[PDB]
């Protein structure tokens, strides 16, 4: 039936042809038909080089498909609708997996799809409210971004973000005490571009760039392989280190612990695609499998930077309740897993009545660390009541 | 539910006994006069008339408590 | 949320007031109160789409009961239609109600399906003789021309099979790789898997026996994943059946890989990734030469489309014959037999005469294979063979033996990704005119 | 459509149809139903107004070939030639001679018993198909002979008191007053198979109170396309004795005993034994 | 609805609160015709059996007995009011009135938790309890 048998034609009259495989909407363009003039477009533009002449003959404009945008949107709709009683970590963790599923799946395409940028902004904004609303009171004036973005290692929530967020320079102020005196620090007075939260897209590398790297890297590897064969020896990895995380198959997959079994895993790309029926849970990274391709993204630089943005332990300390514990070394503390502390709850065999009643405990602990940030005369504009005794 | 059965008060107010805590006319009429001057049942009701026919022996010999799950 | 519930509540009340007036004088007052259980019993009977009938009961009563059960069903069903539309749009509603509504829709879908399967068999013959022969004939010429040598039914003595076993087991385990809490079926499954590791020969021996013997299995469970736009069937199946099938699937594709059989046209992703594959397709389009020239009225057409309801239309009787062409008949018969069984959802049961479950570990393989057959029907021998290449030296995903070989035919390129078909053709002004006139 | 030397096999009435909506002298302006029944009625009425008496449209029409004998005799052919007359006859007991209502009618609406509709299924053989035939000659006199369960009032019998050279039946397959429609699927078994010389699909319906003897000659089918509806049309062909489906430019021969395994919608029933007046009247 | 009994005088209300020593006494105050007083009458009736061991339920109508309107202050279609040992109990649902209950609760389960919470906290003489789910937003 012709609606869903839709046909597009690229010809002299039309701007471009087009197809739509997997979750991507694609457009292939030829210079000879004609075009115009521009420059590097990042995510929007990819360059099709002719294998024979080595000429950049056409451009393919990647874009995220409408149906896949709706799935993302609905996933966010759902996580909320389901989570009446779940703890905040369960919410946030689910959101983190959903986002990297899409963010790690589409990667480049996202930047050329304004609709996603709007959608992403709206959905983060929706997400913040659920946690805010889970908190006592129905009104929060500010809630500075530090509390959400700070990594869970420093007692934050570890939220990834693409939305433009203002870290007000009023909230960077930090004070420390030494037996000499009490010193203050504010970088607020330095007037330059203001400080903003780290973006996943910037960390991520455009598809065009990665395709080029894979052609280069794997060709180099092949030549090295030939030499190793001729020289009767095995590659020592140091020969490859220079390209370690580079390639679309991710050359470091060559050194996975289970290769001898994965060698037989054929048809996995359908199966992962086809997995969805077998499992009620639906996953955001349907296109890839880490083992099949290896890791396709690096978590640490972003986390470290968030820490750099956080200002480190000292920055974390002002927001945190850590100095209150009079623990000598920040590094020494290993924090305590809710599940680990929870231990018995996994197997306590009691009337759910004790489910959310104990799951709030991790949330209760979180409040203590950030209470001064959470509670202040300035912050929340609330009636101030002295506690009983 | 023994109390439910019984039916009689003392001439007694409800609040007090428990220990409770809270946390010309004709002329007027004439004047007034000088101014004045479901679905479900419908759907079914029709069936209910249909029932009337059934005999009293049949009303008795009706199977009583059948569980099917 | 309370509307449909409330309606039935008052309806029952009305009949109760009405019933004492209406009749059943002989019946006792205590007996009349139970009457409500039968109303509940009638509803319970009504639920699950199963005929319900009791003993001593009023005629001028049965019809009355039917009238109110239908009224409740209308309320129930309409509510389901309404809530699903809200969910699809994302409109704020209820996460309970979100669950309740899903529940009601899964029963309504299952009721529809059970009737559809019944009607297909009762109808007596979707295939027709002319169509069946056409299908068969096409397959015969494909196999003739392709030159692929059937894939032998898997042996006890396969070097590859022992190795694959590992691969199959990993796939099965992945489902429980991170579960802190298991139910009894999950625990049983893991136990079975551990036993398999402990004694592979028994595992393997039993599996071979099942392929050779067992023709009638046991229906699994079916649930739906709610994606807020389309629902996806999720299947729960017996572990013994699942392990055997998982292994078989690994074998067959390895055999297909080793035994070829599936051409470069299909897009499995064993070698190439889909997002990237889309990009390559764009790159391939750019790569096409003489492809952008329109000086003489040449025109390009991109056609995209889908199989739609492929599962309903699978021919169990046809499928068996098509599998015989490929594998030893004992395997073909096993695979076919495994098919239609019993589908359960609470009260409801039906027999899937023409039903394929996506949630099976080897469903992917079946779907690709069946789609391939349809590709032959749609593609044609002259151009499809050009794309595939000779059976002696097949082409890769998007390539031809020569420019002349591409030029010979409108369908220059062909890609199949399970059930998604992509065909590339460029028309001259004259060719375009011809098509338009016809 | 009768042309023996058509340049292609098939024809395009799309311009006729659009001229019937666009050309106000027909307000063919029906929508939201738009069936074989509705359009048949709208056509019949139109033809009778638009060929009519002295204005060639009621002399050539044929006010013999049916006769909804009650009222109007219009274009002669389609007030005869499509109407029948059901004399309804309300009664009461005592001596209260309740009243008779002749009504002319171009198509006879059969009911169809009490199909559950707001009830899910595996349907048919696991809710109701076989005994389909709550239906046969269903009424057997309609309201009139045996089962005068005539809910409306004191007494009824609904006699078919004129009996027309064709007789259209239209099966009530459903109540568009409510939602989209769970129809009345209860299969409608009259693939009558009976002539002796039989396996003839001998259709032959004889009046089981009187005699008149009528042979099936058309049969609209409903089909349940996931997109609109569809409406295919099965015609007798006396001379080869071969039933003929047509189905969007396609044509196919059909075993006349297996006709009823589709969802019947509209039948034309020719009168023979009037071809005993015209078996004798050649 | 015919499952759950009704209280036809204010004297049936008061004795019923007193005579049940060991269980909650839950009362729905509201009138038969109401849209929202019919809905609750369902969600309770379904639950009443499950809970028979710690809670007892009854039905009262503002029109049948209006004696109690001013003292407990009854407004709107219906109010659910919990009693244990003659002591009016009290819970914060996040709604901004800690006395009684107003809004229509949605699930059977979330209703049983509230009853169970009130009883358990109540048994200890505690006068306030906290509803685990706080439907301030809902109502």
UniProtKB/Swiss-Prot annotation, chain B:
Entry's localization field: Nucleus, Nucleoplasm; Nucleus speckle
Domain of life: Eukaryota
Disulfide bonds: none
Post-translational modification Phosphoserine, affected residues: 45
Tissue: Widely expressed.
Modification after translation (UniProt): Phosphorylated by PRP4K during spliceosome assembly.
Assembly description: Identified in the spliceosome B complex. Identified in the spliceosome C complex. Associates with the U5 snRNP particle. Component of the U4/U6-U5 tri-snRNP complex composed of the U4, U6 and U5 snRNAs and at least PRPF3, PRPF4, PRPF6, PRPF8, PRPF31, SNRNP200, TXNL4A, SNRNP40, DDX23, CD2BP2, PPIH, SNU13, EFTUD2, SART1 and USP39, LSm proteins LSm2-8 and Sm proteins. Interacts with ARAF. Interacts with AR and NR3C1, but not ESR1, independently of the presence of hormones. Interacts with USH1G.
Function field: Involved in pre-mRNA splicing as component of the U4/U6-U5 tri-snRNP complex, one of the building blocks of the spliceosome. Enhances dihydrotestosterone-induced transactivation activity of AR, as well as dexamethasone-induced transactivation activity of NR3C1, but does not affect estrogen-induced transactivation.
Protein name: Pre-mRNA-processing factor 6
Species, as recorded: Homo sapiens (Human)
Gene giving rise to this polypeptide: PRPF6
Residue window of the full protein shown: 6 to 167 of 941
UniProtKB/Swiss-Prot annotation, chain C:
Job of this protein: Plays a role in pre-mRNA splicing as core component of precatalytic, catalytic and postcatalytic spliceosomal complexes, both of the predominant U2-type spliceosome and the minor U12-type spliceosome. Functions as a scaffold that mediates the ordered assembly of spliceosomal proteins and snRNAs. Required for the assembly of the U4/U6-U5 tri-snRNP complex, a building block of the spliceosome. Functions as a scaffold that positions spliceosomal U2, U5 and U6 snRNAs at splice sites on pre-mRNA substrates, so that splicing can occur. Interacts with both the 5' and the 3' splice site.
Protein name as catalogued: Pre-mRNA-processing-splicing factor 8
Associated clinical condition: Retinitis pigmentosa 13: A retinal dystrophy belonging to the group of pigmentary retinopathies. Retinitis pigmentosa is characterized by retinal pigment deposits visible on fundus examination and primary loss of rod photoreceptor cells followed by secondary loss of cone photoreceptors. Patients typically have night vision blindness and loss of midperipheral visual field. As their condition progresses, they lose their far peripheral visual field and eventually central vision as well.
Region (Reverse transcriptase homology domain): 138-438
Organism: Homo sapiens
Subcellular location: Nucleus; Nucleus speckle
Disulfide cross-links: none
Coverage span on the entire protein: 675 to 1112 of 2335
Tissue specificity: Widely expressed.
Residues modified to Phosphoserine: 185
UniProtKB/Swiss-Prot annotation, chain D:
Localisation per UniProt entry: Nucleus
Domain USP span(s) in chain numbering: 1-272
Subunit structure comment from the entry: The U4/U6-U5 tri-snRNP complex is a building block of the precatalytic spliceosome (spliceosome B complex). Component of the U4/U6-U5 tri-snRNP complex composed of the U4, U6 and U5 snRNAs and at least PRPF3, PRPF4, PRPF6, PRPF8, PRPF31, SNRNP200, TXNL4A, SNRNP40, SNRPB, SNRPD1, SNRPD2, SNRPD3, SNRPE, SNRPF, SNRPG, DDX23, CD2BP2, PPIH, SNU13, EFTUD2, SART1 and USP39, plus LSM2, LSM3, LSM4, LSM5, LSM6, LSM7 and LSM8.
Physiological role: Deubiquitinating enzyme that plays a role in many cellular processes including cellular antiviral response, epithelial morphogenesis, DNA repair or B-cell development. Plays a role in pre-mRNA splicing as a component of the U4/U6-U5 tri-snRNP, one of the building blocks of the precatalytic spliceosome. Specifically regulates immunoglobulin gene rearrangement in a spliceosome-dependent manner, which involves modulating chromatin interactions at the Igh locus and therefore plays an essential role in B-cell development.
Family indicated by similarity: Belongs to the peptidase C19 family.
Protein name: Ubiquitin carboxyl-terminal hydrolase 39
Native species: Homo sapiens
Upper classification of the organism: Eukaryota, Metazoa, Chordata, Craniata, Vertebrata
Gene: USP39
Residues of the full protein shown: 284 to 565 of 565
Swiss-Prot record, chain E:
Assembly with partners or alone: Component of the precatalytic spliceosome (spliceosome B complex). Component of the U5 snRNP complex. Component of the U4/U6-U5 tri-snRNP complex. The U4/U6-U5 tri-snRNP complex is a building block of the precatalytic spliceosome (spliceosome B complex). The U4/U6-U5 tri-snRNP complex is composed of the U4, U6 and U5 snRNAs and at least PRPF3, PRPF4, PRPF6, PRPF8, PRPF31, SNRNP200, TXNL4A, SNRNP40, SNRPB, SNRPD1, SNRPD2, SNRPD3, SNRPE, SNRPF, SNRPG, DDX23, CD2BP2, PPIH, SNU13, EFTUD2, SART1 and USP39, plus LSM2, LSM3, LSM4, LSM5, LSM6, LSM7 and LSM8. Directly interacts with CD2BP2.
Keyword Phosphoprotein: yes
Disease annotated for this entry: Burn-McKeown syndrome: A disease characterized by choanal atresia, sensorineural deafness, cardiac defects, and typical craniofacial dysmorphism consisting of narrow palpebral fissures, coloboma of the lower eyelids, prominent nose with high nasal bridge, short philtrum, cleft lip and/or palate, and large and protruding ears. Intellectual development is normal.
Post-translational modification: The disulfide bond seen in structures determined by X-ray crystallography and NMR is not essential for protein folding and function.
UniProtKB keywords: Cell cycle, Cell division, Deafness, Disulfide bond, Mitosis, mRNA processing, mRNA splicing, Nucleus, Phosphoprotein, Spliceosome
UniProt xrefs under Pfam families: DIM1 (PF02966)
Keyword Lipoprotein set for record: no
Predominant place of localization: nucleus
């Amino acid at each position: 039936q012709w609606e869903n048998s839709f046909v597009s034609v690229y010809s002299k009259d039309n701007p471009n042809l087009l197809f739509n495989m997997c979750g991507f909407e694609c457009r292939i363009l030829p210079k000879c038909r004609t075009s115009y003039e521009e420059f590097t477009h990042k995510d929007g533009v990819w360059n099709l080089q002719n294998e024979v002449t080595k000429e950049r003959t056409a451009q393919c404009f990647l874009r995220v498909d409408d149906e896949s945008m709706q799935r993302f949107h609905n996933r966010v709709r759902q996580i909320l609708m389901a989570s009446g009683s779940t703890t905040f970590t369960k919410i946030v963790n689910k959101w983190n997996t959903a986002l990297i599923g899409l963010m790690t799946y589409f990667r480049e395409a996202v930047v050329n799809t304004q609709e996603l940028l709007d959608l992403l902004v709206k959905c983060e904004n929706k997400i913040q409210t659920r946690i805010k609303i889970g908190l006592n009171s129905k009104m929060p004036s500010r809630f500075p971004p530090v509390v959400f973005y700070t990594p869970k290692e420093l007692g934050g929530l570890g939220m990834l973000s693409m939305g433009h967020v203002l870290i007000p320079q009023s909230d960077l102020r930090w004070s420390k005490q030494t037996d000499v005196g009490i010193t203050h620090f504010r970088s607020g007075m330095s007037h330059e571009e203001d400080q903003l939260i780290p973006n996943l897209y910037r960390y991520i590398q455009p598809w065009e760039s990665e395709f080029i790297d894979s052609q280069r890297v794997w060709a180099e590897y092949a030549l090295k392989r030939q030499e190793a064969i001729a020289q009767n020896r095995r590659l020592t990895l140091e020969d490859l280190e220079d390209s370690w995380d580079r390639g679309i198959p991710r050359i470091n997959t060559l050194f996975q612990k289970d290769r001898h079994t994965l060698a037989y895993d054929k048809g996995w790309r359908v199966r992962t695609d086809f997995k969805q029926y077998q499992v009620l849970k639906q996953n955001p990274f349907w296109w890839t499998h880490q083992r099949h391709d290896g890791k396709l993204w690096n978590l640490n630089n972003y986390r470290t930077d968030m820490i750099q943005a956080l200002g480190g332990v000292e920055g974390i300390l002002e927001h945190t309740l850590f100095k209150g514990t009079y623990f000598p070394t920040w590094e020494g503390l290993f924090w305590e897993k809710a599940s680990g502390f929870e231990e018995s709850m996994k197997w306590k065999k009691l009337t759910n009545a004790q489910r959310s009643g104990l799951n709030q405990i991790p949330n209760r602990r979180f409040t203590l660390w950030w209470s001064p940030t959470i509670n202040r005369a300035n912050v929340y504009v609330g009636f101030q009541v002295q506690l009983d005794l | 539910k023994p109390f439910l059965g019984m039916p009689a008060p003392l001439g007694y107010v409800p609040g007090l006994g428990r220990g409770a805590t809270g946390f010309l006319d004709k002329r007027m009429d004439e004047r007034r006069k000088e101014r004045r001057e479901p679905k479900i049942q419908q759907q079914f009701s029709d069936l209910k008339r249909k029932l009337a026919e059934v005999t009293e022996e049949e009303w008795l010999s009706i199977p009583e408590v059948g569980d099917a799950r | 949320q309370r509307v449909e519930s409330h309606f039935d509540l008052e309806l029952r009340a009305a009949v109760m007031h009405d019933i004492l007036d209406m009749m059943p004088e002989g019946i006792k007052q205590n007996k009349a109160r139970t009457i409500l259980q039968h109303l509940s019993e009638a509803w319970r009977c009504w639920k699950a789409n199963i005929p319900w009938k009791v003993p001593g009961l009023p005629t001028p009563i049965e019809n009355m009961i039917l009238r109110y059960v239908k009224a409740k069903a209308d309320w129930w069903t309409n509510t389901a239609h309404y809530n699903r539309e809200r969910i699809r749009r994302g409109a704020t509603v209820d996460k309970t109600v979100c669950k309740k509504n899903l529940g009601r829709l899964t029963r309504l879908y299952l009721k529809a399906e059970q009737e559809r399967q019944h009607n297909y068999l009762k109808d007596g013959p979707y295939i027709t003789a002319e169509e069946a022969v056409a299908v068969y004939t096409t397959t015969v010429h494909w196999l003739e021309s392709r030159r692929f040598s059937p894939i032998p039914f898997p042996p006890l003595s396969y070097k590859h099979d022992t190795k694959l076993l590992i691969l199959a087991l990993e796939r099965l385990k992945e489902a429980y790789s991170v579960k802190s809490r298991l139910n009894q079926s999950q625990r049983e499954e893991l136990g079975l898997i551990e036993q398999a590791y402990d004694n592979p020969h028994e595992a393997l021996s039993r599996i071979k026996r099942h392929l050779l013997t067992q023709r009638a299995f046991k229906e699994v469970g079916i649930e739906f994943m709610d994606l807020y736009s389309h629902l996806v069937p999720v299947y729960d199946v017996e572990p013994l059946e699942k392990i055997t099938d998982a292994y078989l699937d690994q074998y067959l594709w390895y055999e297909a890989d080793k035994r070829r059989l599936f051409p470069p046209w299909i897009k499995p992703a064993d070698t190439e990734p889909p997002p990237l594959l889309v990009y390559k397709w764009c790159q391939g389009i750019n790569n096409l030469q003489d492809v952008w020239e329109t000086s003489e009225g040449e025109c390009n057409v991109m056609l995209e489309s889908r199989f739609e309801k492929m599962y309903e239309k699978i021919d169990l009787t046809l499928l068996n014959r098509l599998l015989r062409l490929i594998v030893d008949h004992n395997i073909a018969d096993y695979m076919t037999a495994k098919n239609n069984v019993v589908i359960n959802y609470k009260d409801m049961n039906h027999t899937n005469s023409y039903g394929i479950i996506r949630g099976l570990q080897f469903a992917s393989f079946i779907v690709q294979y069946y789609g391939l057959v349809m590709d032959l029907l749609v593609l044609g021998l002259h151009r499809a063979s050009e794309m595939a290449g000779p059976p002696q030296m097949p082409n890769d995903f998007l390539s031809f033996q020569d420019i002349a070989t591409e030029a010979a035919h409108p369908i220059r390129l062909f890609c199949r990704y399970i059930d998604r078909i992509h065909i590339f053709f460029r028309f001259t002004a004259d060719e375009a005119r011809d098509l338009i006139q016809r | 459509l009768w042309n023996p030397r058509n340049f292609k096999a098939h024809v395009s009435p799309h311009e006729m149809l659009q001229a019937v909506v666009l050309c106000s002298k027909k307000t063919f302006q029906i929508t939201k139903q738009g069936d074989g029944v509705d359009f048949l009625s709208w056509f019949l009425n139109a033809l009778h107004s638009a060929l009519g008496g002295t204005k060639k449209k009621k002399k050539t029409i044929v006010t013999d070939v049916f006769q909804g004998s009650m009222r109007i005799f219009t274009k002669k052919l389609p007030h005869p030639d499509l109407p029948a007359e059901e004399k309804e006859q309300l009664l009461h007991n005592d001596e209260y001679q309740e009243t008779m209502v002749e009504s002319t009618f171009m198509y006879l609406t059969l009911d169809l018993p009490t199909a559950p509709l707001y009830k899910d299924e595996k349907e048919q053989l696991i809710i109701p198909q076989v005994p389909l035939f709550n239906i046969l000659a269903k009424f057997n006199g309609i309201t009139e002979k045996e089962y005068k369960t005539y809910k409306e009032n004191f007494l009824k019998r609904f006699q078919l008191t004129k009996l027309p050279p064709y007789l259209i039946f239209c099966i009530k397959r459903f109540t568009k007053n409510n939602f989209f429609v769970e129809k009345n699927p209860t299969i409608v078994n009259f693939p009558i198979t009976n002539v002796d010389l039989r396996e003839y699909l001998s259709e032959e319906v004889q009046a089981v109170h009187k005699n008149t003897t009528y042979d099936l000659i058309a049969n609209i089918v409903h089909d349940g396309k996931p997109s609109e509806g569809s409406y295919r049309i099965h015609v007798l062909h006396h001379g080869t004795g071969k039933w003929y489906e047509l189905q969007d430019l396609q044509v196919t021969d059909i075993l006349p005993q297996m006709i009823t395994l589709s969802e019947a919608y509209i039948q034309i029933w020719k009168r023979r034994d009037n071809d005993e007046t015209n078996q004798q009247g050649a | 609805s015919y499952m759950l009994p009704h209280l036809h005088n204010g004297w049936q209300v008061d004795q019923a609160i007193l005579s049940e020593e060991d269980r909650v006494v839950v009362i729905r105050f509201g009138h038969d015709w109401d849209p929202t007083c019919m809905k609750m009458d369902e969600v309770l009736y379904s639950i009443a059996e499950k809970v028979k061991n710690f809670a007892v339920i009854y039905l009262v109508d503002i029109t049948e007995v209006p004696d109690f309107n001013k003292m407990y202050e009854l407004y709107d279609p219906c109010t659910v009011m919990f009693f244990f040992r003659n002591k009016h109990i009290m819970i914060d649902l996040g709604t901004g009135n800690n006395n009684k209950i107003n809004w229509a609760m949605e699930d059977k389960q979330e209703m049983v938790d509230i009853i169970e919470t009130v009883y358990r906290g109540a048994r200890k003489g505690r006068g306030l309890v906290v509803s685990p789910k706080d439907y301030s937003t809902k109502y």
